[PDB]
Protein backbone atom coordinates (compact mmCIF):
# COMPACT_ATOMS: atom_id res chain seq x y z
CA UNK A 385 0.00 0.00 0.00
CA UNK A 386 1.73 3.19 -1.21
CA UNK A 387 1.13 6.51 0.50
CA UNK A 388 1.61 9.84 -1.29
CA UNK A 389 1.83 11.50 2.14
CA UNK A 390 5.27 9.86 2.64
CA UNK A 391 8.49 9.59 0.61
CA UNK A 392 9.51 6.41 2.49
CA UNK A 393 9.61 3.42 0.17
CA UNK A 394 7.29 0.42 0.45
CA UNK A 395 10.15 -1.48 2.14
CA UNK A 396 10.84 1.29 4.65
CA UNK A 397 13.85 2.95 3.03
CA UNK A 398 14.16 6.67 3.77
CA UNK A 399 17.71 7.62 2.73
CA UNK A 400 16.25 10.37 0.52
CA UNK A 401 14.14 13.31 1.73
CA UNK A 402 12.15 15.62 -0.54
CA UNK A 403 14.79 18.32 -0.90
CA UNK A 404 17.71 19.11 -3.18
CA UNK A 405 20.44 18.84 -0.54
CA UNK A 406 19.20 15.41 0.59
CA UNK A 407 19.14 14.12 -3.01
CA UNK A 408 22.60 15.45 -3.88
CA UNK A 409 24.07 13.93 -0.72
CA UNK A 410 23.13 10.33 -1.63
CA UNK A 411 22.38 10.09 -5.40
CA UNK A 412 24.81 9.56 -8.28
CA UNK A 413 23.99 9.30 -11.99
CA UNK A 414 24.41 5.59 -12.84
CA UNK A 415 27.13 4.18 -15.06
CA UNK A 416 24.60 2.20 -17.13
CA UNK A 417 23.13 5.43 -18.49
CA UNK A 418 26.53 6.84 -19.42
CA UNK A 419 27.46 3.49 -20.99
CA UNK A 420 24.19 3.01 -22.88
CA UNK A 421 24.28 6.10 -25.19
CA UNK A 422 21.07 5.31 -27.13
CA UNK A 423 17.36 4.88 -26.41
CA UNK A 424 14.10 4.81 -28.36
CA UNK A 425 11.21 7.21 -27.58
CA UNK A 426 7.73 6.03 -28.67
CA UNK A 427 5.08 8.75 -29.01
CA UNK A 428 1.84 6.75 -29.29
CA UNK A 429 -1.60 7.56 -27.89
CA UNK A 430 -5.09 8.88 -28.53
CA UNK A 431 -3.47 11.67 -30.61
CA UNK A 432 -2.35 8.98 -33.08
CA UNK A 433 -6.01 8.35 -34.07
CA UNK A 434 -6.65 11.60 -36.03
CA UNK A 435 -3.13 11.03 -37.44
CA UNK A 436 -2.62 14.79 -37.72
CA UNK A 437 0.99 14.64 -36.50
CA UNK A 438 0.52 16.62 -33.29
CA UNK A 439 0.34 15.62 -29.65
CA UNK A 440 -1.11 19.12 -29.12
CA UNK A 441 -4.27 18.26 -31.10
CA UNK A 442 -6.18 18.10 -27.79
CA UNK A 443 -5.22 21.68 -26.87
CA UNK A 444 -5.69 23.40 -30.24
CA UNK A 445 -8.93 21.66 -31.25
CA UNK A 446 -10.72 23.75 -28.58
CA UNK A 447 -9.06 27.00 -29.76
CA UNK A 448 -11.75 28.51 -32.00
CA UNK A 449 -10.29 29.41 -35.39
CA UNK A 450 -7.07 27.41 -35.02
CA UNK A 451 -6.21 25.25 -38.09
CA UNK A 452 -6.66 22.15 -35.93
CA UNK A 453 -10.02 23.37 -34.60
CA UNK A 454 -11.19 24.01 -38.18
CA UNK A 455 -9.92 20.59 -39.28
CA UNK A 456 -11.63 18.87 -36.37
CA UNK A 457 -15.05 20.48 -36.79
CA UNK A 458 -15.09 19.59 -40.49
CA UNK A 459 -13.67 16.09 -40.11
CA UNK A 460 -15.22 14.80 -36.86
CA UNK A 461 -17.91 17.24 -35.73
CA UNK A 462 -18.68 20.21 -33.48
CA UNK A 463 -16.81 20.39 -30.18
CA UNK A 464 -20.02 19.67 -28.27
CA UNK A 465 -20.83 16.42 -30.12
CA UNK A 466 -17.23 15.31 -30.67
CA UNK A 467 -14.58 16.12 -28.08
CA UNK A 468 -11.10 14.70 -27.71
CA UNK A 469 -12.53 11.97 -25.45
CA UNK A 470 -14.55 10.70 -28.43
CA UNK A 471 -11.42 9.50 -30.24
CA UNK A 472 -10.89 7.01 -27.40
CA UNK A 473 -13.37 4.34 -28.67
CA UNK A 474 -11.55 4.44 -32.02
CA UNK A 475 -8.16 3.86 -30.37
CA UNK A 476 -8.47 0.09 -30.62
CA UNK A 477 -4.77 -0.80 -31.23
CA UNK A 478 -5.79 -3.97 -33.06
CA UNK A 479 -2.25 -4.62 -34.34
CA UNK A 480 -0.28 -3.61 -31.22
CA UNK A 481 2.18 -6.32 -30.20
CA UNK A 482 4.68 -5.61 -27.43
CA UNK A 483 7.15 -8.25 -28.62
CA UNK A 484 7.16 -6.81 -32.16
CA UNK A 485 7.81 -3.29 -30.82
CA UNK A 486 10.75 -4.55 -28.77
CA UNK A 487 12.16 -6.48 -31.75
CA UNK A 488 12.26 -3.18 -33.64
CA UNK A 489 13.86 -1.38 -30.69
CA UNK A 490 16.44 -4.15 -30.23
CA UNK A 491 17.25 -4.16 -33.97
CA UNK A 492 18.38 -0.52 -33.68
CA UNK A 493 21.13 -1.18 -31.14
CA UNK A 494 19.32 0.95 -28.58
CA UNK A 495 19.80 -0.03 -24.92
CA UNK A 496 16.67 1.46 -23.31
CA UNK A 497 13.09 2.16 -24.39
CA UNK A 498 10.85 5.07 -23.37
CA UNK A 499 7.16 4.68 -24.25
CA UNK A 500 4.82 7.50 -23.26
CA UNK A 501 3.02 6.38 -20.10
CA UNK A 502 0.83 9.51 -20.24
CA UNK A 503 0.97 12.66 -22.40
CA UNK A 504 -0.60 16.11 -21.77
CA UNK A 505 -4.01 14.90 -23.02
CA UNK A 506 -4.92 13.11 -19.76
CA UNK A 507 -5.16 9.48 -21.00
CA UNK A 508 -3.12 6.96 -19.00
CA UNK A 509 -1.41 4.35 -21.22
CA UNK A 510 -1.18 2.05 -18.17
CA UNK A 511 -3.24 0.41 -15.42
CA UNK A 512 -4.09 3.48 -13.35
CA UNK A 513 -6.23 3.28 -10.24
CA UNK A 514 -7.21 6.93 -9.77
CA UNK A 515 -7.42 7.91 -13.47
CA UNK A 516 -10.39 6.12 -15.03
CA UNK A 517 -9.44 7.47 -18.47
CA UNK A 518 -6.88 4.74 -19.08
CA UNK A 519 -5.91 2.17 -21.69
CA UNK A 520 -6.90 -0.83 -19.55
CA UNK A 521 -10.50 0.36 -19.11
CA UNK A 522 -10.78 2.08 -22.52
CA UNK A 523 -9.40 2.16 -26.03
CA UNK A 524 -6.96 -0.72 -26.48
CA UNK A 525 -8.37 -2.35 -23.31
CA UNK A 526 -4.91 -3.57 -22.31
CA UNK A 527 -2.03 -2.44 -20.14
CA UNK A 528 0.22 -1.06 -22.89
CA UNK A 529 2.95 -0.05 -20.45
CA UNK A 530 2.74 -3.40 -18.66
CA UNK A 531 3.05 -5.39 -21.89
CA UNK A 532 6.01 -3.24 -22.97
CA UNK A 533 7.68 -3.81 -19.58
CA UNK A 534 7.41 -7.61 -19.91
CA UNK A 535 8.57 -7.51 -23.54
CA UNK A 536 11.55 -5.30 -22.63
CA UNK A 537 12.76 -7.76 -19.97
CA UNK A 538 12.60 -10.69 -22.41
CA UNK A 539 14.47 -8.56 -24.96
CA UNK A 540 17.26 -7.93 -22.44
CA UNK A 541 16.97 -4.12 -22.58
CA UNK A 542 16.25 -1.51 -19.89
CA UNK A 543 12.73 -0.15 -19.41
CA UNK A 544 11.94 3.55 -19.03
CA UNK A 545 8.89 5.72 -19.59
CA UNK A 546 7.79 9.34 -19.87
CA UNK A 547 5.18 11.44 -18.09
CA UNK A 548 3.71 14.64 -19.53
CA UNK A 549 0.74 14.75 -17.14
CA UNK A 550 1.86 17.91 -15.30
CA UNK A 551 0.71 19.94 -18.33
CA UNK A 552 -2.76 18.35 -18.21
CA UNK A 553 -3.59 20.90 -15.49
CA UNK A 554 -3.89 23.62 -18.17
CA UNK A 555 -3.77 21.84 -21.55
CA UNK A 556 -7.54 22.06 -22.17
CA UNK A 557 -7.96 25.70 -21.04
CA UNK A 558 -9.36 26.83 -24.40
CA UNK A 559 -12.32 24.46 -24.04
CA UNK A 560 -13.76 26.84 -21.44
CA UNK A 561 -13.91 29.82 -23.82
CA UNK A 562 -15.98 28.22 -26.61
CA UNK A 563 -18.97 25.85 -26.45
CA UNK A 564 -17.46 22.39 -26.00
CA UNK A 565 -17.57 19.22 -23.90
CA UNK A 566 -14.63 20.54 -21.83
CA UNK A 567 -17.11 22.88 -20.14
CA UNK A 568 -18.66 19.81 -18.48
CA UNK A 569 -16.29 20.07 -15.54
CA UNK A 570 -17.19 16.54 -14.34
CA UNK A 571 -15.09 14.99 -17.15
CA UNK A 572 -11.76 14.38 -15.44
CA UNK A 573 -9.91 13.64 -18.70
CA UNK A 574 -9.72 17.39 -19.40
CA UNK A 575 -7.79 18.18 -16.19
CA UNK A 576 -7.95 21.35 -14.11
CA UNK A 577 -8.60 23.65 -17.13
CA UNK A 578 -6.22 26.30 -15.77
CA UNK A 579 -4.44 29.01 -17.74
CA UNK A 580 -1.04 27.97 -19.09
CA UNK A 581 1.79 29.27 -16.86
CA UNK A 582 3.67 32.34 -18.06
CA UNK A 583 7.40 32.31 -18.75
CA UNK A 584 9.46 32.27 -21.94
CA UNK A 585 10.73 28.76 -22.56
CA UNK A 586 12.91 26.88 -20.08
CA UNK A 587 12.33 29.08 -17.01
CA UNK A 588 10.90 28.28 -13.54
CA UNK A 589 9.00 31.58 -13.39
CA UNK A 590 5.29 31.19 -14.05
CA UNK A 591 4.00 34.78 -13.87
CA UNK A 592 0.37 35.21 -12.81
CA UNK A 593 -0.55 31.57 -13.56
CA UNK A 594 0.92 28.70 -11.53
CA UNK A 595 0.06 26.05 -14.11
CA UNK A 596 -0.95 23.63 -11.34
CA UNK A 597 -3.16 23.50 -8.27
CA UNK A 598 -3.57 21.47 -5.09
CA UNK A 599 -5.51 18.69 -6.81
CA UNK A 600 -3.24 18.30 -9.85
CA UNK A 601 -0.15 18.27 -7.63
CA UNK A 602 -1.79 15.50 -5.58
CA UNK A 603 -2.74 13.51 -8.68
CA UNK A 604 0.82 13.89 -9.98
CA UNK A 605 2.11 12.09 -6.88
CA UNK A 606 -0.60 9.43 -7.20
CA UNK A 607 0.37 9.08 -10.87
CA UNK A 608 4.15 8.78 -10.38
CA UNK A 609 3.78 6.52 -7.31
CA UNK A 610 1.56 4.25 -9.46
CA UNK A 611 4.23 4.02 -12.19
CA UNK A 612 7.02 3.44 -9.65
CA UNK A 613 5.14 0.76 -7.69
CA UNK A 614 3.65 -1.12 -10.63
CA UNK A 615 6.38 -0.95 -13.31
CA UNK A 616 9.66 -0.10 -11.48
CA UNK A 617 10.98 1.90 -14.46
CA UNK A 618 14.73 2.39 -14.63
CA UNK A 619 14.24 5.86 -16.15
CA UNK A 620 11.41 8.40 -15.95
CA UNK A 621 11.39 11.37 -18.38
CA UNK A 622 9.29 14.47 -17.60
CA UNK A 623 8.09 17.35 -19.76
CA UNK A 624 9.03 20.91 -19.07
CA UNK A 625 6.52 22.35 -16.60
CA UNK A 626 7.60 20.12 -13.68
CA UNK A 627 10.35 22.72 -13.18
CA UNK A 628 8.00 25.68 -12.65
CA UNK A 629 8.54 27.06 -9.13
CA UNK A 630 5.05 26.19 -7.72
CA UNK A 631 5.58 22.54 -8.76
CA UNK A 632 9.06 21.96 -7.35
CA UNK A 633 8.18 20.88 -3.76
CA UNK A 634 5.91 18.26 -5.33
CA UNK A 635 8.59 17.13 -7.78
CA UNK A 636 11.13 16.62 -4.98
CA UNK A 637 8.68 14.34 -3.16
CA UNK A 638 8.44 12.16 -6.27
CA UNK A 639 12.25 12.13 -6.69
CA UNK A 640 12.83 11.07 -3.09
CA UNK A 641 10.23 8.30 -3.33
CA UNK A 642 11.69 7.10 -6.66
CA UNK A 643 15.30 7.03 -5.43
CA UNK A 644 14.30 5.37 -2.13
CA UNK A 645 12.38 2.65 -4.00
CA UNK A 646 15.27 2.08 -6.41
CA UNK A 647 17.55 1.25 -3.47
CA UNK A 648 15.15 -1.56 -2.53
CA UNK A 649 15.13 -2.88 -6.12
CA UNK A 650 18.96 -2.99 -6.22
CA UNK A 651 18.63 -0.93 -9.41
CA UNK A 652 20.04 2.53 -10.16
CA UNK A 653 17.64 4.89 -11.92
CA UNK A 654 17.53 8.14 -13.92
CA UNK A 655 15.17 11.12 -13.92
CA UNK A 656 15.15 13.41 -16.97
CA UNK A 657 14.02 17.03 -16.73
CA UNK A 658 14.42 19.99 -19.09
CA UNK A 659 15.27 22.63 -16.44
CA UNK A 660 14.89 23.57 -12.79
CA UNK A 661 17.00 20.93 -11.01
CA UNK A 662 20.74 20.48 -10.48
CA UNK A 663 22.80 18.57 -13.03
CA UNK A 664 23.98 16.15 -10.31
CA UNK A 665 20.55 15.06 -9.00
CA UNK A 666 19.05 14.30 -12.44
CA UNK A 667 20.05 13.95 -16.10
CA UNK A 668 19.28 17.07 -18.13
CA UNK A 669 17.31 16.50 -21.32
CA UNK A 670 18.20 19.48 -23.51
CA UNK A 671 18.58 20.64 -27.07
CA UNK A 672 22.09 20.33 -28.47
CA UNK A 673 22.66 24.00 -29.25
CA UNK A 674 25.55 25.21 -31.38
CA UNK A 675 28.45 24.62 -28.96
CA UNK A 676 31.22 22.23 -29.93
CA UNK A 677 32.15 21.71 -26.27
CA UNK A 678 32.10 18.51 -24.27
CA UNK A 679 29.58 18.86 -21.44
CA UNK A 680 30.90 18.11 -17.96
CA UNK A 681 27.63 16.41 -16.82
CA UNK A 682 25.87 13.53 -18.63
CA UNK A 683 22.91 14.72 -20.69
CA UNK A 684 20.23 13.49 -23.06
CA UNK A 685 18.77 14.96 -26.23
CA UNK A 686 15.70 13.94 -28.22
CA UNK A 687 14.82 14.00 -31.91
CA UNK A 688 12.22 12.30 -34.08
CA UNK A 689 12.83 10.06 -37.07
CA UNK A 690 9.97 11.95 -38.70
CA UNK A 691 10.90 15.26 -40.31
CA UNK A 692 7.39 16.68 -39.71
CA UNK A 693 6.14 14.99 -36.56
CA UNK A 694 6.78 12.81 -33.50
CA UNK A 695 3.46 10.97 -33.40
CA UNK A 696 2.22 9.37 -36.61
CA UNK A 697 0.78 11.41 -39.48
CA UNK A 698 0.08 10.41 -43.06
CA UNK A 699 2.57 11.79 -45.53
CA UNK A 700 5.41 11.68 -43.03
CA UNK A 701 8.85 12.25 -44.57
CA UNK A 702 11.42 10.39 -42.48
CA UNK A 703 15.01 11.48 -41.89
CA UNK A 704 17.81 9.46 -43.44
CA UNK A 705 19.93 7.05 -41.37
CA UNK A 706 23.00 9.09 -42.44
CA UNK A 707 21.43 12.19 -40.86
CA UNK A 708 20.63 10.44 -37.58
CA UNK A 709 23.93 8.55 -37.27
CA UNK A 710 26.05 11.67 -37.87
CA UNK A 711 24.12 13.52 -35.18
CA UNK A 712 24.30 10.51 -32.84
CA UNK A 713 28.10 10.46 -33.10
CA UNK A 714 28.28 14.21 -32.48
CA UNK A 715 26.08 13.82 -29.38
CA UNK A 716 28.07 10.90 -27.93
CA UNK A 717 31.39 12.72 -28.40
CA UNK A 718 30.08 15.64 -26.30
CA UNK A 719 29.00 13.33 -23.40
CA UNK A 720 25.35 13.00 -24.47
CA UNK A 721 22.83 10.22 -25.01
CA UNK A 722 20.40 10.21 -27.95
CA UNK A 723 16.72 9.43 -27.27
CA UNK A 724 15.33 8.84 -30.79
CA UNK A 725 11.57 8.91 -31.34
CA UNK A 726 9.36 6.76 -33.55
CA UNK A 727 5.62 7.24 -34.05
CA UNK A 728 3.52 4.13 -34.66
CA UNK A 729 0.15 4.21 -36.39
CA UNK A 730 -2.98 4.30 -34.22
CA UNK A 731 -3.55 0.58 -34.89
CA UNK A 732 -0.19 -0.20 -33.23
CA UNK A 733 2.07 -0.82 -36.24
CA UNK A 734 5.45 0.83 -36.64
CA UNK A 735 5.83 1.96 -40.23
CA UNK A 736 8.12 0.08 -42.61
CA UNK A 737 10.09 3.29 -43.20
CA UNK A 738 10.75 3.85 -39.50
CA UNK A 739 11.58 0.17 -39.00
CA UNK A 740 14.10 0.49 -41.83
CA UNK A 741 15.77 3.58 -40.34
CA UNK A 742 16.21 1.86 -36.97
CA UNK A 743 17.54 -1.35 -38.60
CA UNK A 744 20.15 0.63 -40.58
CA UNK A 745 21.25 2.35 -37.36
CA UNK A 746 21.55 -1.06 -35.70
CA UNK A 747 23.56 -2.41 -38.63
CA UNK A 748 25.96 0.53 -38.27
CA UNK A 749 26.29 -0.11 -34.52
CA UNK A 750 26.92 -3.81 -35.15
CA UNK A 751 30.22 -2.84 -36.80
CA UNK A 752 31.03 0.44 -35.04
CA UNK A 753 29.51 -0.03 -31.55
CA UNK A 754 32.91 -0.50 -29.89
CA UNK A 755 33.46 3.25 -30.29
CA UNK A 756 30.04 4.04 -28.78
CA UNK A 757 28.90 1.71 -26.00
CA UNK A 758 30.68 2.38 -22.71
CA UNK A 759 32.72 5.22 -24.21
CA UNK A 760 33.51 8.62 -22.68
CA UNK A 761 34.60 11.92 -24.25
CA UNK A 762 38.24 12.34 -25.26
CA UNK A 763 40.08 15.63 -24.61
CA UNK A 764 38.14 17.42 -27.37
CA UNK A 765 34.99 16.36 -29.18
CA UNK A 766 35.54 17.34 -32.81
CA UNK A 767 37.58 18.89 -35.59
CA UNK A 768 36.75 20.10 -39.09
CA UNK A 769 34.30 22.51 -40.73
CA UNK A 770 22.15 33.65 -41.55
CA UNK A 771 23.58 32.88 -45.00
CA UNK A 772 20.79 34.19 -47.34
CA UNK A 773 21.58 31.28 -49.70
CA UNK A 774 21.20 27.53 -49.58
CA UNK A 775 24.87 26.75 -48.95
CA UNK A 776 24.42 22.93 -49.13
CA UNK A 777 27.09 22.52 -46.49
CA UNK A 778 27.60 18.86 -45.55
CA UNK A 779 29.98 16.82 -43.45
CA UNK A 780 33.21 15.63 -45.11
CA UNK A 781 35.80 13.12 -43.91
CA UNK A 782 37.67 16.03 -42.28
CA UNK A 783 34.71 16.41 -39.89
CA UNK A 784 35.80 14.05 -37.11
CA UNK A 785 34.30 13.18 -33.71
CA UNK A 786 36.26 11.52 -30.90
CA UNK A 787 35.46 9.01 -28.19
CA UNK A 788 37.63 6.95 -25.87
CA UNK A 789 37.16 3.56 -24.23
CA UNK A 790 39.66 1.27 -22.45
CA UNK A 791 42.39 3.83 -23.35
CA UNK A 792 41.66 3.39 -27.08
CA UNK A 793 41.07 6.52 -29.19
CA UNK A 794 38.20 6.37 -31.70
CA UNK A 795 38.22 9.02 -34.45
CA UNK A 796 34.94 8.94 -36.37
CA UNK A 797 34.87 10.55 -39.82
CA UNK A 798 31.35 11.72 -40.62
CA UNK A 799 31.79 10.98 -44.38
CA UNK A 800 33.96 8.97 -46.78
CA UNK A 801 37.03 10.01 -48.75
CA UNK A 802 39.18 8.10 -51.21
CA UNK A 803 42.16 10.09 -49.93
CA UNK A 804 43.44 10.85 -46.45
CA UNK A 805 42.50 12.88 -43.40
CA UNK A 806 44.82 14.55 -40.90
CA UNK A 807 43.83 14.31 -37.24
CA UNK A 808 44.85 17.85 -36.29
CA UNK A 809 44.12 17.32 -32.59
CA UNK A 810 47.28 15.14 -32.51
CA UNK A 811 49.58 17.87 -33.84
CA UNK A 812 52.93 18.28 -32.09
CA UNK A 813 51.91 21.19 -29.86
CA UNK A 814 49.08 19.21 -28.20
CA UNK A 815 51.26 16.18 -27.44
CA UNK A 816 54.04 14.96 -25.18
CA UNK A 817 55.78 11.78 -26.43
CA UNK A 818 52.73 10.56 -28.35
CA UNK A 819 53.56 7.31 -30.14
CA UNK A 820 50.98 5.69 -32.40
CA UNK A 821 50.95 1.96 -31.70
CA UNK A 822 48.31 0.88 -34.23
CA UNK A 823 45.46 2.20 -36.39
CA UNK A 824 42.58 0.19 -37.86
CA UNK A 825 39.18 0.98 -39.33
CA UNK A 826 36.37 -0.81 -37.49
CA UNK A 827 34.92 -3.54 -39.68
CA UNK A 828 37.70 -3.36 -42.28
CA UNK A 829 40.21 -6.12 -42.93
CA UNK A 830 42.58 -3.71 -44.75
CA UNK A 831 45.78 -2.53 -43.13
CA UNK A 832 45.50 1.22 -42.66
CA UNK A 833 48.38 3.32 -43.98
CA UNK A 834 49.10 6.13 -41.50
CA UNK A 835 51.87 8.57 -40.70
CA UNK A 836 52.40 10.64 -37.59
CA UNK A 837 53.43 14.15 -38.65
CA UNK A 838 53.83 17.50 -36.95
CA UNK A 839 50.44 18.57 -38.34
CA UNK A 840 48.75 15.52 -36.84
CA UNK A 841 48.10 11.87 -37.59
CA UNK A 842 47.63 11.37 -41.33
CA UNK A 843 45.30 8.43 -41.98
CA UNK A 844 44.63 7.05 -45.45
CA UNK A 845 41.19 5.54 -46.01
CA UNK A 846 41.03 1.89 -47.16
CA UNK A 847 39.59 0.92 -50.53
CA UNK A 848 36.39 -0.76 -49.27
CA UNK A 849 33.78 0.87 -47.03
CA UNK A 850 32.85 -1.41 -44.09
CA UNK A 851 29.62 0.56 -43.56
CA UNK A 852 27.95 3.68 -44.87
CA UNK A 853 27.34 6.94 -42.97
CA UNK A 854 30.34 7.29 -40.63
CA UNK A 855 33.70 5.58 -40.38
CA UNK A 856 35.63 4.74 -37.23
CA UNK A 857 39.39 4.66 -36.83
CA UNK A 858 40.43 2.80 -33.68
CA UNK A 859 43.80 4.22 -32.58
CA UNK A 860 46.06 2.70 -29.94
CA UNK A 861 48.59 5.23 -28.71
CA UNK A 862 50.77 6.14 -25.78
CA UNK A 863 51.62 9.67 -24.65
CA UNK A 864 49.85 12.65 -23.11
CA UNK A 865 47.49 14.81 -25.15
CA UNK A 866 45.94 18.14 -24.13
CA UNK A 867 42.92 19.91 -25.60
CA UNK A 868 42.74 23.37 -27.09
CA UNK A 869 41.97 25.71 -24.16
CA UNK A 870 38.46 27.12 -23.68
CA UNK A 871 37.88 30.59 -22.21
CA UNK A 872 34.93 31.96 -20.22
CA UNK A 873 34.43 35.34 -18.52
CA UNK A 874 34.25 35.37 -14.69
CA UNK A 875 34.62 39.02 -13.51
CA UNK A 876 37.98 40.84 -13.81
CA UNK A 877 39.44 37.62 -15.23
CA UNK A 878 38.76 34.50 -17.26
CA UNK A 879 38.25 30.82 -16.57
CA UNK A 880 40.38 28.46 -18.67
CA UNK A 881 39.21 24.87 -19.17
CA UNK A 882 41.42 22.14 -20.60
CA UNK A 883 41.18 18.36 -20.76
CA UNK A 884 44.24 16.10 -20.56
CA UNK A 885 44.45 12.44 -21.55
CA UNK A 886 47.34 10.28 -20.32
CA UNK A 887 47.45 7.32 -22.71
CA UNK A 888 50.67 6.02 -21.09
CA UNK A 889 50.75 2.96 -18.83
CA UNK A 890 52.60 5.10 -16.23
CA UNK A 891 51.31 8.12 -14.32
CA UNK A 892 52.32 11.45 -15.85
CA UNK A 893 53.05 14.85 -14.34
CA UNK A 894 51.87 17.69 -16.57
CA UNK A 895 52.41 21.46 -16.39
CA UNK A 896 49.84 23.86 -17.86
CA UNK A 897 50.56 27.58 -18.11
CA UNK A 898 48.07 30.33 -18.96
CA UNK A 899 49.46 33.80 -19.64
CA UNK A 900 46.69 36.40 -19.98
CA UNK A 901 47.58 40.11 -20.13
CA UNK A 902 50.94 39.28 -18.58
CA UNK A 903 49.34 37.46 -15.62
CA UNK A 904 50.78 33.92 -15.43
CA UNK A 905 48.89 30.99 -13.91
CA UNK A 906 50.54 27.57 -13.74
CA UNK A 907 49.24 24.24 -12.52
CA UNK A 908 51.06 20.98 -11.86
CA UNK A 909 48.71 18.02 -12.37
CA UNK A 910 49.32 14.31 -11.80
CA UNK A 911 47.30 12.38 -14.39
CA UNK A 912 46.99 8.69 -13.63
CA UNK A 913 47.94 6.09 -16.24
CA UNK A 914 45.28 5.53 -18.93
CA UNK A 915 43.00 8.24 -17.60
CA UNK A 916 41.59 11.67 -18.45
CA UNK A 917 40.75 14.70 -16.38
CA UNK A 918 39.35 18.22 -16.59
CA UNK A 919 41.71 21.00 -15.54
CA UNK A 920 40.37 24.43 -14.62
CA UNK A 921 42.49 27.56 -14.20
CA UNK A 922 41.58 31.20 -13.62
CA UNK A 923 43.61 34.26 -14.57
CA UNK A 924 42.95 37.42 -12.55
CA UNK A 925 43.09 41.13 -13.41
CA UNK A 926 41.86 40.91 -17.01
CA UNK A 927 40.50 44.36 -17.86
CA UNK A 928 38.65 43.41 -21.06
CA UNK A 929 37.58 39.88 -21.94
CA UNK A 930 37.18 40.80 -25.61
CA UNK A 931 40.65 42.37 -25.74
CA UNK A 932 42.95 40.11 -23.72
CA UNK A 933 46.15 38.59 -25.09
CA UNK A 934 46.17 34.83 -24.43
CA UNK A 935 49.05 32.36 -24.53
CA UNK A 936 48.72 28.77 -23.34
CA UNK A 937 51.59 26.34 -22.75
CA UNK A 938 51.65 22.56 -22.31
CA UNK A 939 55.06 21.46 -20.99
CA UNK A 940 56.70 24.58 -22.44
CA UNK A 941 55.14 24.17 -25.90
CA UNK A 942 52.87 26.96 -27.12
CA UNK A 943 49.54 25.22 -27.77
CA UNK A 944 47.37 28.30 -28.25
CA UNK A 945 47.56 32.03 -28.76
CA UNK A 946 44.93 34.52 -29.89
CA UNK A 947 47.19 36.77 -31.97
CA UNK A 948 44.84 36.06 -34.93
Ligand SMILES: [K+]
Pocket residue numbers: 706710779798799853854
Ligand atom coordinates in the same frame (compact mmCIF):
# COMPACT_ATOMS: atom_id res chain seq x y z
K1 LIG B 1 27.70 10.90 -42.82
